[PDB]
Amino acid sequence: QSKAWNRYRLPNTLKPDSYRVTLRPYLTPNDRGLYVFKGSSTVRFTCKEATDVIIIHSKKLNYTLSQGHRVVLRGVGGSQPPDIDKTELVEPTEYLVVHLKGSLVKDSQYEMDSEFEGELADDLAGFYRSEYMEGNVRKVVATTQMQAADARKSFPCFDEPAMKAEFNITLIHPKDLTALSNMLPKGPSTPLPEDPNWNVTEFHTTPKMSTYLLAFIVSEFDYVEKQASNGVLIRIWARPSAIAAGHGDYALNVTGPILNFFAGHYDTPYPLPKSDQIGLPDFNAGAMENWGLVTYRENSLLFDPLSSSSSNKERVVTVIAHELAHQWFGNLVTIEWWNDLWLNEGFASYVEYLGADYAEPTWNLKDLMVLNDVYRVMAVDALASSHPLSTPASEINTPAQISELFDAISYSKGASVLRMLSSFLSEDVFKQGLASYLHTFAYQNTIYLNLWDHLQEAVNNRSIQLPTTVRDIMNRWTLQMGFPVITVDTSTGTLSQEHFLLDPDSNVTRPSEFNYVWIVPITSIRDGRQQQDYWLIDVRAQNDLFSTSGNEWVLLNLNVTGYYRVNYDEENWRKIQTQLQRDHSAIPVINRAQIINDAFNLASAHKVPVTLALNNTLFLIEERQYMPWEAALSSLSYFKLMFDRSEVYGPMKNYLKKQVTPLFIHFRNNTNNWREIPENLMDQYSEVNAISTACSNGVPECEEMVSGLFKQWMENPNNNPIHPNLRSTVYCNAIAQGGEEEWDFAWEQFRNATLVNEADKLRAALACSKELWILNRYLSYTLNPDLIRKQDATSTIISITNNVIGQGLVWDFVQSNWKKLFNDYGGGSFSFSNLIQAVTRRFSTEYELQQLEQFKKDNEETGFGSGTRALEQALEKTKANIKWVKENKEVVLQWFTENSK
Amino acid sequence: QSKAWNRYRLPNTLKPDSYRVTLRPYLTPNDRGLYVFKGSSTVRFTCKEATDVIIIHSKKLNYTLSQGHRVVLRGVGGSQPPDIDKTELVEPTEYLVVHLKGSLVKDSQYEMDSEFEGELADDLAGFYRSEYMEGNVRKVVATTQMQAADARKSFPCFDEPAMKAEFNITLIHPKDLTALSNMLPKGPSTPLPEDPNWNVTEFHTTPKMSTYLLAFIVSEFDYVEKQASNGVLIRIWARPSAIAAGHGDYALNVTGPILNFFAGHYDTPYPLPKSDQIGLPDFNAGAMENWGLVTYRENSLLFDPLSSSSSNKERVVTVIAHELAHQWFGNLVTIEWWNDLWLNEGFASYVEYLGADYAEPTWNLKDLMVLNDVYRVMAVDALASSHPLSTPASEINTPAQISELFDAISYSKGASVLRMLSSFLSEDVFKQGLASYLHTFAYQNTIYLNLWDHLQEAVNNRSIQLPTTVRDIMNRWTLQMGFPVITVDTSTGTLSQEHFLLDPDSNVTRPSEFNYVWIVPITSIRDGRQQQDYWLIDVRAQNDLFSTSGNEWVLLNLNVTGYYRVNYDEENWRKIQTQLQRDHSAIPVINRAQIINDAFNLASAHKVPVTLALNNTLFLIEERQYMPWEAALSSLSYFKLMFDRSEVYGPMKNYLKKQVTPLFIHFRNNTNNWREIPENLMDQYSEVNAISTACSNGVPECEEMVSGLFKQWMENPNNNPIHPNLRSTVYCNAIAQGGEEEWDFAWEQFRNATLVNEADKLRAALACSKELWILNRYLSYTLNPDLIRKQDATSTIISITNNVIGQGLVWDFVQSNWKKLFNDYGGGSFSFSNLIQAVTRRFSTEYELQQLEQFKKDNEETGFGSGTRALEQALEKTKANIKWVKENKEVVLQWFTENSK
Ligand SMILES: *[C@@H]1O[C@H](CO)[C@@H](O[C@@H]2O[C@H](CO)[C@@H](O[C@@H]3O[C@H](CO)[C@@H](O)[C@H](O)[C@@H]3O)[C@H](O)[C@H]2NC(C)=O)[C@H](O)[C@H]1NC(C)=O
Ligand SMILES: *[C@@H]1O[C@H](CO)[C@@H](O[C@@H]2O[C@H](CO)[C@@H](O[C@@H]3O[C@H](CO)[C@@H](O)[C@H](O)[C@@H]3O)[C@H](O)[C@H]2NC(C)=O)[C@H](O)[C@H]1NC(C)=O
Ligand SMILES: *[C@@H]1O[C@H](CO)[C@@H](O[C@@H]2O[C@H](CO)[C@@H](O)[C@H](O)[C@H]2NC(C)=O)[C@H](O)[C@H]1NC(C)=O
Ligand SMILES: *[C@@H]1O[C@H](CO)[C@@H](O[C@@H]2O[C@H](CO)[C@@H](O)[C@H](O)[C@H]2NC(C)=O)[C@H](O)[C@H]1NC(C)=O
Ligand SMILES: *[C@@H]1O[C@H](CO)[C@@H](O[C@@H]2O[C@H](CO)[C@@H](O)[C@H](O)[C@H]2NC(C)=O)[C@H](O)[C@H]1NC(C)=O
Ligand SMILES: *[C@@H]1O[C@H](CO)[C@@H](O)[C@H](O)[C@H]1NC(C)=O
Ligand SMILES: *[C@@H]1O[C@H](CO)[C@@H](O)[C@H](O)[C@H]1NC(C)=O
């Protein structure tokens, strides 16, 4: 509306300079059984424009009336404050509005004093609490998660990323609990005069930083410390039982070297004297990059060599690299507004791989970046209801809209765009431009224009030849949604580009200033030999680099560097298939995965027959590398979802049973009857994939093997005969093939689980049961925070709807209890989006579409929040599915039968 | 409305005397691929009241215009009929309306001739077609189903049970195809003058009989003939393959003696020269009682000693007895209108047991009457949406309502009421009154008052002392809904009665003139000794017969002869339980089944605790008789329906696994490791129940046993080692435990089955699969007439909704395609009533109730037809289930646990 307090965007009238925040958490429930933290705040601000009102962010904060009002106002340096008329708390916009009897003076400094109290709830937002068990005693830890808009919950502030200020933090805690914040404590802790049982810890002044990178923790966690080569002291904090077991050894091994590697790589030293990585039992997101105090989930930080798998090790190292990369991209240089979220996340989501590559040079995770980032986002970027990488700031106001931006789009598409940009700009020029950008905008806010300008300066300095300026090349990739599909006519060597859409009849409603045309850098190979690069500027082009004679074949997007899909004519497709059947090693592994994924996704978008996509998997019977198998399984996951409840699931499983039986058998010889694991990480991943694929599709040998392993474990509960890498999948199969007794054993083991990794494995496996009543009981369990933690609630439900039997249960449960689910659990976090996506991803029928439409209509008043666009996407996808199966069911079935023999 | 042709009931102005029907079926498709029949019929009728219009029944008939009109009127005995003004066909009331320019003369005879064409469709209604395969040759049979209001489909007629007439049937059939009707042919056949390839068979004039009993069958079936003792030729007709293998020998053995027994018992000789019993490949109901030509479903008549089970044999003898009893009750004496349908079906259901007991004296089938008739109908009779035994004639107008009356109420409650009547009148007086009633109203319609008058005459003649007249005693049971529950206070001996309702809240909209007060004949036993009979004519009474001192216990309703429930004080219930623990044999077997069933139904009525009802099943660990085990399993079926998708199913099965494990073991010793069967039928049934209960609740030895038997059959498809009594349970359990291979093998045997009994066993078993896609494929098959016959469609779907996995499947299928089912199978061979009852019996949540209400709201315009009232009942039951589960779930779950160990 016209009123200032009714607008979600903060007025640019006042600019904060420094805050003083004192916080006193109570870790013992009061007379009402409520955990309450009381605090005092003092915020100093400069008055840029004359105004009669002060608007600051305040969420769920009860203010103690002092001097007759909620807030006290004072001047600085002779400035006089006008008398306060009134104070009001506006819930819809979450704002503390202080109406004054006069007007402030321009270019003057004032201080604003507040006394407040709030709830130390278990919502994993703002200043919250996390509970764990030591022996038979409860322990409560007060921690923070101010991501997006939660800093307003802890204390009154100008909660916007562009409002940078220096914070003076003070924590009043129990005498026996250590207090941790962004900076090192200033002096030693002193007892509170009111009660000697309370300690007062005052920390140093933090540098110019945004309000969402603050962290206040009080806990008895212990730490393992080591001094990095760049003079930064790295400490790993966790529960005493976890640290005493050495679970933080790997994190301490990898944290320091990665930080020093980033500092040397970008020539920008880490400006903080210390870095504390602390694992929290309860944590919403994967991790948070608070400056100086990086908080993790316990599964992403702690690693037990005897019980954690190689996938857990990769997860730990990649998350550590991601959070340490956010130190430069997100903390030193922050976004002007969330709409440019890809500047932070995306950047980290790229360079995390670099960090991992330094920590584990023998793993080659940069190859896995293609499957984890590019083809992950390409699934949702092909929808007509997607959003550009840099949405205009006008469309993104509410906290829920801000939360939705944390989707696969930002992270994965930013990582893929930066990967393509570094590929065509070389790593040297890219990192030189990034270093110049980092030095120029330290402790400041940025937009994509500044990044393009600095990259253009680096290009000019290094004399790099590009068709146009960097800004014009990258505006095609940043300012419009989607990616181009590239059709190659090898008869004439003609290139055509067009906007790729999963549903050709879908109506794109978002206009693009470039009319959905991209300047595409093209890398091609001919008969396995690399060719000279090309630049597709126009809609259609002709060149002899893409013309074939005789048996020559050409492949575009070598190693999948560019962010685009590639389609060929039937001649070149047949040549590629012949090459694959003859000697598939002549094509790069990444290119084989690209071929499989691209064929399947083109078939889903009606560009090529589905028969071609299924034909491209006929060479898997002699393929041993992890990447093509993983790409094929991910592509066939769509078929599994589409036909798991139809007559096609019979032959299709058989077809898979034909393709995977050799690989399985091979690993039986390679692993020496499953007592050893392969040395290479790729081989371990492929072995797990082979076991799972052969074992879900009905190869009797794996069923007997997993049953024997689980019964052997059940005989000796303390000694686990299953190797950690093989644990998860075996568990799942052993619960699917077993009965009530196996489920009860697994549940009892999960209750006693001491490591979060084993607990997660068992929780994921418990949803694999094939009994309806067991699934119903499990679904009832997921809503009980005593049994299953709230952070793991929605995820668990997802596993339940991954089971074919539990799909209907989860859909009915969601339809019945959406009103309740919205209030808690997902709400406006980043989970609801996932639950909606997972529960509606099997819809292929007009009846299911009508059910989804009724679900949307019935919950208009309650709203969807962060799950809005995903729901929209679901609807679109459902329509596509209805048009797909009806067109492609029968033939697909036929094909599977013809190849099931 | 005011228009006569808009009223469903026929006018009383015209009364038919005789019909002459000539029918010519075309058993090959015409130029339009349609099976048609051409007919011509004349009707002689008397004009009781002067009318200017002739309203007759006509359905799906195309009339050739003769003399410018659809029909031609001629005078009889000098009468001069007025000329035809116009002829119209009103579809909603199915009337051919002939308007005349004048008015007919009162007490005058006229003749109406018509030539018509109809379709020989496969709807199993009217004149329809049944197709089978002999080798590779397709054979088509023209048969009839004229029950209810389907006699108008074949030829125009005054289609009402009160409009009796004499029929002259002529059938024009092919040269080599035999023709059969109600009467013997009137001389030998003659070739058709038009085409010598057609024969014209004219039959003798049928006696005064209702229109819905006509049968016209053209087929090449073969027969086995035998002359009964009463000089009536019994001929069993079936397909050549069935007769050649002697599948009709048992029917020949039992049919003649049962007819002779009925004739001797009721002193009324069979008034027709021959009785034909013909088995048809396609038939809606179990059988139909057409006078002289009794049509049966292949399973209700054919019996193979090698492959069929004793249950199949019992069905054959019973169905035969049911139809042979219908001959006296329904053909000789007919109901005035469908609202009094219990005079036909109730009497037939009661006398079928007498006939079967005569044919098979050692089976003791009469006891099963308690389980199959009384306790089956009490469940639907304890509802607020029930209907009385004798519904007012004004409430039954449309054909749909008539079909709805063919429900559990008419059949089973009539059987139970006549059982009580024979109980307190003694069999001698009962059969004397029945003989008088048959003699007086031969070839005439009747109402219940005539039956009461003749029974009162018999009572007065035999000097039987009753509290009041038979009319007043029996109008309580006939004209008002429901049954009473008698509460007994044994400390003082007080008896009270009240209208039994499963839901105390349920409101009874329909009023009762007697205010739901019954005159109850009560029989009691004290410590196993019979006491004097008592008559409860008031709501509350006191008598020392029902007062106990010390450990004395009293049971009411000995051998459940009366149609009422019994409740006791907690003391007497404990005394009964203690007896059952000490020596269960001291209580009669039927009374033990009564105890279990009444306790469970009172617990469901919130009159006694659920723990009591569950306690009464504790003695089953030492119970070997069939009736208590069957009653307990039937009662626990409701618990299984309520809790099979919840946490309670876990313990419940275990408790059953505890109870049935000894019995199963016992039979293993009795049957010598399952190579033999017990001599007694009841013991055979109990063995089947023990095997099924052990395998269903996860008793291992049963699982390995059934798996091994089915695997052995799989090795040798020709040699089936499973005994016919065990085949159904073995097939279902093996398909449940097995996988795709077992289901595929079973399907092949089903599509290559020769005996209907084997096909039914396999069709029932195929729905026991636990895989979702297999269930979807089977559900898709059920709608294909080529794979599963239409007559078996609904039942098969019901089987799928009996599977716990398939419940949501069938619910979604019904919700999506109600219109398709109510159109393609609309008003045809689809039993919507049974389908709704089966699909909606698991509903116990508010979300499911809302879904049911939305289902009702969506299809109001299309209507539910004969499944209307059942739908209402479902709704009522659904709400009652919600309350029962909410209050009993916790106590029930605990009880099972504390008794599962
Ligand atoms: C949070 O801490 C910062 C850093 O201590 C505070 O800024 C400091 O505020 C004090 C206020 O007295 C300043 O002291 C002044 O120094 C000038 C020096 O010329 C002197 O003329 C004045 O009389 C006065 O003593 C101090 O300079 C300033 N900065 C530093 C580096 O200490 C800030 O006010 C705190 N924010 C709060 C309380 O919200
Ligand atoms: C219909 O009734 C007839 C006669 O009541 C049944 O025929 C009888 O069948 C039994 C069983 O096969 C025969 O017993 C056998 O007799 C032979 C000697 O002939 C003996 O070697 C066998 O060990 C056995 O005891 C009985 O003789 C036979 N009677 C006649 C007159 O044929 C027939 O089985 C019934 N059909 C049914 C039940 O479907
Ligand atoms: C809470 O405050 C007390 C009192 O200051 C701290 O106890 C002192 O810890 C220092 C650590 O070097 C010792 O030298 C002193 O002797 C201790 N006692 C006193 C009276 O000073 C205590 O460590 C604080 N707890 C924290 C920081 O968690
Ligand atoms: C962290 O790094 C240290 C040193 O690189 C690792 O310690 C080595 O572990 C290997 C394997 O157990 C031994 O063979 C070496 O002798 C160890 N070296 C020293 C100096 O102790 C340690 O295992 C690493 N922690 C991890 C990977 O969790
Ligand atoms: C159709 O009618 C003809 C004529 O009556 C039947 O043919 C006679 O059949 C009898 C046996 O039923 C023979 O003894 C005669 O010699 C036949 N004569 C003639 C003139 O055909 C014929 O059998 C009938 N077909 C039936 C009843 O299916
Ligand atoms: C703040 O006040 C509201 C309303 O009085 C109350 O519901 C809430 O519990 C208070 N907050 C705390 C932390 O007590
Ligand atoms: C797939 O391969 C088969 C041979 O296995 C071939 O006949 C068919 O044409 C191929 N389909 C396409 C689309 O190339």
Ligand SMILES: *[C@@H]1O[C@H](CO)[C@@H](O)[C@H](O)[C@H]1NC(C)=O
């Ligand atoms: C719980 O798990 C722990 C694992 O450390 C084990 O030592 C303990 O015996 C378990 N207790 C029970 C009751 O299962």
Ligand SMILES: *[C@@H]1O[C@H](CO)[C@@H](O)[C@H](O)[C@H]1NC(C)=O
């Ligand atoms: C009767 O007439 C209607 C309308 O012409 C036609 O659709 C139907 O097929 C006819 N029935 C027969 C058996 O000829």
Ligand SMILES: *[C@@H]1O[C@H](CO)[C@@H](O)[C@H](O)[C@H]1NC(C)=O
């Ligand atoms: C019953 O009627 C029969 C038939 O006439 C008669 O013989 C008999 O005496 C009657 N019984 C009486 C009147 O008690």
Ligand SMILES: *[C@@H]1O[C@H](CO)[C@@H](O)[C@H](O)[C@H]1NC(C)=O
């Ligand atoms: C059922 O039996 C248990 C003991 O087996 C007893 O405690 C309970 O009271 C009984 N139920 C009733 C209703 O008496």
